[PDB]
Structures are given as structure tokens and as C-alpha cells.
Design a protein around this motif. Structure first.
Motif, PDB file in Angstrom:
ATOM      1  N   UNK E  74       0.822  -1.209   0.000  1.00 16.50           N
ATOM      2  CA  UNK E  74       0.000   0.000   0.000  1.00 16.50           C
ATOM      3  C   UNK E  74       0.859   1.264   0.000  1.00 16.50           C
ATOM      4  N   UNK E  81       1.942   7.203  -6.420  1.00 15.69           N
ATOM      5  CA  UNK E  81       1.072   8.356  -6.661  1.00 15.69           C
ATOM      6  C   UNK E  81       1.813   9.678  -6.500  1.00 15.69           C
ATOM      7  N   UNK E  84       4.366   9.926  -9.621  1.00 15.69           N
ATOM      8  CA  UNK E  84       3.616  10.223 -10.839  1.00 15.69           C
ATOM      9  C   UNK E  84       3.121  11.663 -10.836  1.00 15.69           C
ATOM     10  N   UNK E  85       2.560  12.115  -9.716  1.00 13.66           N
ATOM     11  CA  UNK E  85       2.116  13.500  -9.650  1.00 13.66           C
ATOM     12  C   UNK E  85       3.281  14.489  -9.680  1.00 13.66           C
ATOM     13  N   UNK E 103       1.755  -7.612  -4.295  1.00 10.10           N
ATOM     14  CA  UNK E 103       0.376  -8.023  -4.537  1.00 10.10           C
ATOM     15  C   UNK E 103       0.286  -9.402  -5.185  1.00 10.10           C
ATOM     16  N   UNK E 106       1.017 -12.173  -2.654  1.00  9.53           N
ATOM     17  CA  UNK E 106      -0.138 -12.339  -1.767  1.00  9.53           C
ATOM     18  C   UNK E 106      -1.393 -12.883  -2.459  1.00  9.53           C
ATOM     19  N   UNK E 107      -5.088  -7.090  -8.370  1.00  8.92           N
ATOM     20  CA  UNK E 107      -4.608  -5.776  -7.959  1.00  8.92           C
ATOM     21  C   UNK E 107      -3.306  -5.477  -8.710  1.00  8.92           C
ATOM     22  N   UNK E 110      -4.039  -4.426 -12.210  1.00  2.26           N
ATOM     23  CA  UNK E 110      -4.437  -3.024 -12.297  1.00  2.26           C
ATOM     24  C   UNK E 110      -3.191  -2.141 -12.349  1.00  2.26           C
ATOM     25  N   UNK E 147     -13.647  -7.876 -20.028  1.00  2.00           N
ATOM     26  CA  UNK E 147     -13.517  -6.489 -20.488  1.00  2.00           C
ATOM     27  C   UNK E 147     -12.141  -5.882 -20.194  1.00  2.00           C
ATOM     28  N   UNK E 148     -11.599  -6.113 -18.999  1.00  2.00           N
ATOM     29  CA  UNK E 148     -10.276  -5.580 -18.666  1.00  2.00           C
ATOM     30  C   UNK E 148      -9.170  -6.303 -19.427  1.00  2.00           C
ATOM     31  N   UNK E 180     -16.343  -3.330 -31.770  1.00  2.00           N
ATOM     32  CA  UNK E 180     -14.956  -3.572 -31.572  1.00  2.00           C
ATOM     33  C   UNK E 180     -14.604  -4.811 -32.321  1.00  2.00           C
ATOM     34  N   UNK E 182     -15.660  -5.645 -35.247  1.00  2.00           N
ATOM     35  CA  UNK E 182     -15.341  -5.204 -36.599  1.00  2.00           C
ATOM     36  C   UNK E 182     -13.960  -4.591 -36.654  1.00  2.00           C
ATOM     37  N   UNK E 214     -22.594  -8.456 -38.821  1.00  2.00           N
ATOM     38  CA  UNK E 214     -22.367  -7.018 -38.742  1.00  2.00           C
ATOM     39  C   UNK E 214     -21.039  -6.633 -39.369  1.00  2.00           C
ATOM     40  N   UNK E 219     -18.269  -1.294 -43.531  1.00  2.00           N
ATOM     41  CA  UNK E 219     -17.227  -0.591 -44.268  1.00  2.00           C
ATOM     42  C   UNK E 219     -15.845  -1.154 -43.984  1.00  2.00           C
ATOM     43  N   UNK E 250     -14.831   7.382 -42.444  1.00  2.00           N
ATOM     44  CA  UNK E 250     -14.440   6.873 -41.130  1.00  2.00           C
ATOM     45  C   UNK E 250     -12.970   7.237 -40.964  1.00  2.00           C
TER      46      UNK E 250
END
Lengths: 45, 60, 287, 129, 275, 286
Positions: E74, E81, E84-85, E103, E106, E107, E110, E147-148, E180, E182, E214, E219, E250
């Protein structure tokens, strides 16, 4: 509406970060505390 | 007819996203509360660790 | 239930620091302040149950002050937030401000910038809507936006900078508002609807500063960099306003405003800025 | 007639781009919600572990104490209709995910409070030993 | 406010392990590292974002020495952070790598994706960015987060194609298709054309036309067909025409432009080799 | 499985406070109440597995009472909610009410106002639908709406105030219902038209056609979507029929409206009351 949704979830990411860190930190402290009570019981016997 | 169907679908999706905005507001509020309570939990866990350590030293 | 007044009297009696020779025999005064805070929190909870929300707020403020004296600043910040919530629900916006300011100061001291930014934004909202202290509301939205920008929360930063730019433009600080809109545009590029609005508002601020050339540059920029602004009603409207300003025709500007309003309702902010632009044209005509 | 068709073309171009817009948010939002929902899963595991450890602590503390324009309009509408289908689907999926996470968050809150109370209890008991 | 420099000096004094005869009388050094970490975290909070990051790194190292690895992870994320900032992308990378390692032990996916983004955009270390997006996509695939995983594999395939690894990019697009749609078919075919394998591009076109209605009437399918035809004829001008026609309806993004230019160059090179 | 009756008997034996000289040697009775609560919860779980849901509820009530005696009020509130769930699923709406009231009291004392509001709304639903105690249902929806308003949850507050205004109007408290509809209007597009209509209808049922006409004018000026709505035209036609004292024209306008937009039971009841007030004035003039 979608724009606002992204914005709100970006905001909520922040809360999730702190919650995860704090609960994780707490778990390690609780584990240590239990270890201490175990040794305490070992001595008190 | 195709454009009217498209309009109907967009209106329905607007409704669903509007519902979602209300839900994410409820979610943000829940998360603010949980952050406060998780902070409390971390503090209490540290306090418990320290107290148990002090009793460990006492019994020793 | 205990009487909250008696609880507060007990808190006050315990919260006296150990003075003199007694300080050599008394342990840390921290525990006395903790117990006084707990008594104040109990009183505050009872007042809240009675809906005596201002007295609950005052009791939480006393609790937070005792928590600060104990060294428990994180608790004090939370208790200041509870005081704030009580005062806000009680319609005492002044004490709500003071509570949030103390909470924000603690949160920033604990490096909880984000938390402080949430509350700094809420402070800006209280200053704007309840107290009409627009200058401090501007300062609050700007600083909250900066703290969110440091947290990489582009979205919250943009919400704050929108509020800041809108208030700055309504206060006649048109150039600074245009600069904040330029930041909002840059942060929003490549991410569009708000963007069109940002381009329009930037141009409108520039027109209110009587700088039609900067408005024309903003129009050209937007038309080149975002195709949705290029073909938008907002772009055509901004163009028509630039044209009317360069011609000095306040009537044509009013016509274009009515035409735009018929298709896309002008909110109160746009009306105010457009009236200022019209007045600057009419003043040049009168001069 | 020509002017109106041109206006229609401009409107549909703008609408398509904004259709593709409502899409980037939905895919990013779902991504972030997946990340946060998963950050919730790690939290949930830690809370479960702390419940078990508090049980152990309870018992140890107790023992311690004891011790052209027409065609483009059509094509832009084609593109807008397809995107609209995904905006609707994404909105539905996002609603479902928020529902699930809302119940999970409610349970996380309750468990966190319960653990906090148990820890304060055992700390007070240890103070007296 | 306390001075963060004095806090760090106190952390450094406490974080010395008990050596020698003192180790027989001192309890576990863990508590000393915890207190040093707490002092470092206080200093980091007071800090000057780079100095805050460095203080969090010191705190995380002490937390690791205490055995509190989850806390260290953590704290490494908080260091990240801050860096990076602060625009210190190197220390942000190092912080994320330590956090990810904790991690995963033992995220991590990500943060591995965010690491890939830093490698891609700030450091232009595209090879490691590819490795980061691939491994993050795999970790999400094991978690059934389609999705990820797809977001990561899109980034991986795009970077691999821009790095000239066209075959591997085509294989990742085949995974994205199977998972996506296509756009994926088009990009797969484009990679195959950049590999001078027009037959595989034609197969991808036929596959897409049969499996997704589809895509069949899209196109993207017609454009991929026209590009395959121009490649088989060796007519780099017809390819450029089809690119302009497609772009008018397009808009071609920068990735497609780069890959299409590579395909054109391969045609022109074959023309020159035949004269 | 353990016998739940024997578990409850053990809970009862442990839950006796230490009296007399034994109080000097016994530690805190809190631990005895905790263990009695745990035994009661085990019994409740076994009854729930047997679908003996009322006995599970009663066992959770005993557990919650022991948890209160231990000082563990947050647990008691959760256990009261489990008792409520058992009683509601068992069709014992009375004990469900009592369980929710204890849970709500605990939650409000702990500052968990939003949570208490959720359960206060569910309490209102039980009072309305199962017990037909409409007065207490009104009080429940009002207080829940207020707690949500303090929490800035406009949507939940509005849901409660809608239920409150509807019940108040059906109970003949037409003026107070109109005031709640004015709050709903101010706090608030599709529902807004309905709120204006219902406000006006309440005012007509109070025989105050002037306030109904003012509500119509307000709505027509402030919301363009109400101005051109069927609800606005219908409210106008009802105001006109009331001012003319023509109960037949009112019934015609009701039928016309019903053909295009079905009148729900609430509107029918209020419209019948308005018609009756017209007919009574006609009879008083002959």
C-alpha cells in the motif's frame, strides 16, 4: 450522463484505495495482536 | 421508422443511465462511510495490537 | 437518557489541564481530554436525537477541540465533519464553514488532500449558495480543483474548475475565467459535449473582455482541434457573436441570442455574459 | 432543400461522434468498476480473516482474564444505431454491477463496524489485565 | 508542524537492527521497523511530491523489514502516486514494480496496466509496455474479467503491430475476436498485410464475413477487401485511393495510417524489385 | 443438530444477571449475555432451517435483548433486522413491526439515520399493506422522507413523500397532501406533471378551486412540459367544471381523460370526492 458517471467513478476510486489500504493494515495489526495475546497466555499459565 | 426506433432506444438508454447516476451517488455515499469506518478499524486494530503487547510484557 | 448539559459540565471539569504541583503527579492530560471528548460526543448524540442540531454541532466542536488537545487529530477531523453536518442540517452556515475549515486543515495536515478537497468543494458550495461569499467560493473551487488534479482525478478537478470559471466570469474576471476554460479544454481534449460548452464559454468571456480577436482564435482552435465543435451550434453561435461584435451591431447580437435560445436554451450564466457583451457594444456606440 | 440536407448531415456527424463518446465512458467506467469491485474483493477477504482472528482473540482474552448527402445521412444513422445498441447494453451492465456492488458495500460496512466494536471490547478488557 | 527531516532522522535511528549482544536482550526488531515506518509516513505526509515519494519508499522498506508486506505494498502505491504526480516517472515505475510484486505474492494487474501506461507514454519503453499489457491481460483473463483483459490485449496488440511484430499482433487480435469486433477484424487483416501475407488477410476477411453478419456488411470489411485486392494487384496507388475513400467516411487513426503506410511501402518495394 | 429448545433453555440460564454476594466475585455480566445471545442465535438459525420462521424471529428477539444487555447495540439492531425478516416471511406482521421499531430506534441512536430511514419506510409499507394502520404509515413515510432529505438523497425522500401525500389525500387531509406535493414539486419531468395534477386534485377536494387554478397557472408558467400536457388540460377542465357546479361535465372530462391516460385508483377516489362536493352544493341550492 455517461460523462458524469465516469467522473463519479473516478472519484470513488479514491475511496476504494483508502479502504483497501486501511482494512489490509488493520488485518496485519490484528494478526500481531493475536500473537501477543498468545504469548501472554503462554506466560500467564 | 428506423430513426424513430433509434430515438426510442436512445431515450431508454438515457433512462437507464439516469438510474445509474442515482445509483452511483448512493455508492459514493456508501464508500465515504466505509472509508470512515475502515479508518476507525485501522486505529482500533493498532490499539488492540499495542494493548495486547503491553499485556504480553506484563505477564512476562 | 443522560442530560446533555450535565455531560458537557462533566466534560468541562475533566478538560482542565493539570496545573502546578499536580502536574508532577498526574499522568498525561491526554486521557482527560479523551474522556472529556467522549462526554461531549455523548451530549452531541443526545442533542441530535432531539433535533437540537445546532447544540449538537457545538458539542461536537467542543469534542473536536478536546481531541486536538489529546493529540488525536484524525478523530478531531472526523468530529469536525460531524459538527459540520449538524450545523448544515440546522441552517447555521457560518458554523458549518468554520467546522469544515478546521476539518480541512486537519485533513490536509494528515496528507488526506483528496478528503480535504471533497470538503473544500462542499465549503465552496456553502460559500456560494448560503453566504453569497463568491470570492471565497472561487478560492475554494480553485484549490479543490488543484488538489484533485494532483490526485489525477481529472473529473473532480474539472467539476471544480467549471464552478471556479463560472463564478470568475460572473464576477467580471473574464480573462482568468477564459484561462481556466483553456485548462478545462486541454484536460478534456481527446477524452466533447462539455468541450463545446467550454469553447463557447471561453469565447464569451473573451467577448466580455472586449477582445474579439482572442474569441476568433478560440473559435478557430476549437474548429480545428475538435470536429464536433466545428459543426456545432455553439461554434456557429460564437462566430455570429464575434461577427456582431466586430460590426458593433448590438441588435444583430440580440437576434442571434434569440435564435440560439429557441434551439438550445441559454442558462442564466450565458444570459448574464451576453448582456455584458451587448452593453459593451452599446457603450461603444454611445461613446 | 440543399441547405436543410447539409444541416442534417452536420447534425448526424455530430450525433455519431457523441454516440462513440457515450461509449468511451461506458468502457472505462466498466473497467474502473471492475477494478474497484475487485479492490472490494481483497477488502472482503481481509475482513473475513479478521473475523476469524477476533474469535481467537476473544478466547485468549477470556482466558487471560481468568488467569451524396442522403447516403451519408443513412450511413451516419447506421453508425449511430449500432453505437446506441452498445450504449444501451453498457448502461444495463453498469446498472447490474452497481446493484451487486451496493449489496457488497452494505455488507462490508456492517462487518467493518462489527470488527471495530469487537476490537474496542478486547482492548478495554486487556487494559484491565 | 514537525520537521520532516527530523522525523526521517529519527526513523533512520530506529530502523537500525539490533546487532550483537544487544540482540539477546532486545525483543523483535519488527516493532522498531514499524515505528520507523510510521515516522517516515509522517514525513512523507508533511512533504514537495518527490520527497514525499522517497519518504514513502523508506516507509515501505521498513514495513517489509517488519513483515507487514501488505502495508508495504500500500505504501509503495502511495509513493507511486506521489512520484507520478511529481513527474518522476522512473521512481513511479520502481514503486509500482515493488507494489505489484507484493500483490502477486499475496490488484497487481491493475497496477501492471498503469505501469504499462507509464512505460508507453512517459518513458517510451514500448517493449516493457507490451510485456506489462500482456501480463495484465493474462491476469485479468484468469479472473474471468473479459472487459479488462480485452483492454490490455488491445494495447498489447496495437503496440506489437507498431513495433513490427505483425504476426503476434494478429494472434492477439484473434484472441480478442474469439473473446470492436469489426475493428479487431480490420486490424488483424492489416497486420497480416503488413506481414506480406495477403492469403491470411483474405482468410480473416472470409472468417469475419461468415461469423459476424455485422462485419459482413460493414465498411471495415469492404475496406479490408479492397486493400487485399490492391495488394494482390501490386497497385500502391489504388491502395492509397481506397485509404482516402475510407478516411473520408471513417477517420483513420494514427495506428491505421502507420500500418497502411507500411503495406504501401511493401507494394512499392515489390514493384521496384521487379523493374 | 442441537435442539433449539435446549439451546434457548441454556441461553435463559446464562442470561440471569449476577445477584447479591456473587456480584462481588463475578466479572462483568456482559460476557454472560453475549453467550446467551449466541445460543439464541443458534436456536434461531435452526428454526429458520426448519422453516419455523416465527420461532426463529422470537429467538432473534431474545438474542437482541441479550445483546442490548451486553452493551452491543449495533449487533442488537442487526439481530432485530433478522427477527423482522423472519416474522415478515412468516406472515406475523405485528412482530415484524415491533422488530423494525427496535432496530430503527437503535440505528437512529447510533446516527445511522439513512439505515433507519430504509427500515422506517419498510415499516410504513407493513403498516399500509398488512395492518391497514394508515395513520402510522403516514407518520413513517413522513419521518423517513425527512431523514432522507437531511441525507441529501432527493430520490428516496421523494419516494417517501409521494407515499405520504397519497395516503394523506386518501385520508381526507387534502391540504397537507397539497403541501407535500408542493415540496415534491420544488424538489423536482414525467413525475412533475403528475405532482401538479395531484396537488390540484387535492385542492379541488378541499373545495378550494382558487388554489387549484393558482397551481395550474404556476405549473403552466414554471414547467413547459406541464403547460402542453394532458394533465394540465384535465386539471383546467376540472377547475372549470367545479366553478360551474356541473358534476356531469366533470364526469365527462374524467371519462375523456381515462380513455387516453388510465386513472389509477387514487385519482378515481379523489375525483369521486370532488364530484360529491359539487352534487352536495347543487342539492343545497334546490
Amino acid at each position: 450522463l455517461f460523462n458524469d458517471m465516469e467522473e463519479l467513478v473516478i472519484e470513488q476510486q479514491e475511496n476504494v484505495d483508502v479502504i483497501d489500504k486501511n482494512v489490509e493494515d488493520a488485518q496485519l495489526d490484528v494478526e500481531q495482536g493475536v500473537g501477543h495475546t498468545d504469548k501472554a497466555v503462554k506466560s500467564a499459565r | 421508422s428506423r430513426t424513430a426506433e433509434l430515438q426510442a432506444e436512445i431515450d431508454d438508454t438515457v433512462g437507464i443511465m439516469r438510474d445509474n447516476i442515482n445509483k452511483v451517488a448512493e455508492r459514493g455515499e456508501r464508500l465515504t462511510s466505509i472509508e470512515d469506518k475502515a479508518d476507525n478499524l485501522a486505529v482500533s486494530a493498532q490499539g488492540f495490537k499495542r494493548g495486547a503487547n503491553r499485556v504480553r510484557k506484563a505477564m512476562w | 437518557m443522560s442530560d446533555p448539559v450535565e455531560l458537557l459540565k462533566r466534560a468541562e471539569k475533566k478538560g482542565v489541564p493539570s496545573s502546578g504541583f499536580m502536574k508532577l503527579f498526574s499522568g498525561s492530560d491526554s486521557y482527560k481530554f479523551e474522556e472529556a471528548a467522549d462526554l461531549c460526543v455523548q451530549a452531541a448524540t443526545i442533542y441530535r436525537l432531539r433535533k437540537e442540531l445546532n447544540l449538537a454541532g457545538d458539542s461536537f466542536l467542543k469534542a473536536a477541540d478536546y481531541q486536538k488537545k489529546a493529540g488525536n487529530e484524525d478523530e478531531a477531523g472526523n468530529t469536525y465533519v460531524e459538527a459540520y453536518k449538524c450545523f448544515k442540517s440546522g441552517g447555521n452556515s457560518v458554523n458549518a464553514v468554520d467546522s469544515l475549515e478546521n476539518a480541512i486543515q486537519i485533513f490536509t495536515h494528515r496528507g488526506q488532500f483528496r478528503r480535504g478537497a471533497n470538503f473544500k468543494f462542499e465549503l465552496g458550495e456553502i460559500l456560494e449558495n448560503d453566504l453569497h461569499d463568491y470570492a471565497k467560493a472561487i478560492d475554494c473551487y480553485e484549490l479543490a480543483g488543484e488538489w484533485y488534479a494532483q490526485d489525477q482525478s481529472v473529473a473532480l478537478s474539472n467539476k471544480c474548475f467549471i464552478k471556479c470559471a463560472d463564478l470568475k466570469a460572473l464576477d467580471g474576471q473574464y480573462i482568468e475565467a477564459s484561462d481556466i476554460y483553456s485548462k478545462l479544454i486541454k484536460s478534456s481534449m481527446g477524452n466533447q459535449w462539455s468541450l463545446k460548452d467550454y469553447f463557447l464559454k471561453k469565447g464569451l468571456c473573451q467577448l466580455a473582455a472586449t477582445d474579439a480577436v482572442a474569441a476568433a482564435r478560440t473559435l478557430q482552435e476549437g474548429q480545428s482541434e475538435d470536429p464536433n465543435f466545428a459543426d456545432s451550434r455553439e461554434s456557429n453561435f460564437l462566430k455570429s457573436l464575434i461577427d456582431a461584435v466586430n460590426e458593433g451591431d448590438s441588435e444583430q447580437l440580440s437576434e442571434h441570442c434569440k435564435e440560439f435560445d429557441n434551439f438550445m436554451r441559454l442558462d442564466k450564466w450565458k444570459i448574464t455574459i451576453l448582456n455584458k457583451i451587448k452593453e459593451s457594444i452599446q457603450q461603444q456606440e454611445d461613446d | 432543400i440543399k441547405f436543410t440536407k447539409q444541416s442534417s448531415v452536420a447534425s448526424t456527424r455530430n450525433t455519431l461522434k457523441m454516440a462513440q463518446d457515450a461509449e468511451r465512458a461506458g468502457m472505462n467506467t466498466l473497467g474502473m468498476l471492475g477494478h474497484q469491485s475487485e479492490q472490494l474483493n481483497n477488502v472482503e477477504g481481509n475482513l473475513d480473516l479478521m473475523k476469524v482472528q477476533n474469535k481467537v482473540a476473544d478466547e485468549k482474552v477470556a482466558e487471560l482474564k481468568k488467569l451524396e448527402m442522403e447516403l451519408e445521412i443513412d450511413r451516419n444513422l447506421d453508425q449511430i444505431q449500432q453505437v446506441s445498441n452498445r450504449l444501451k447494453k453498457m448502461a444495463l451492465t453498469t446498472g447490474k454491477e452497481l446493484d451487486s456492488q451496493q449489496k457488497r458495500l452494505n455488507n462490508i460496512e456492517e462487518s467493518t463496524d462489527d470488527l471495530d466494536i469487537n476490537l474496542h471490547m478486547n482492548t478495554n478488557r486487556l487494559a484491565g489485565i
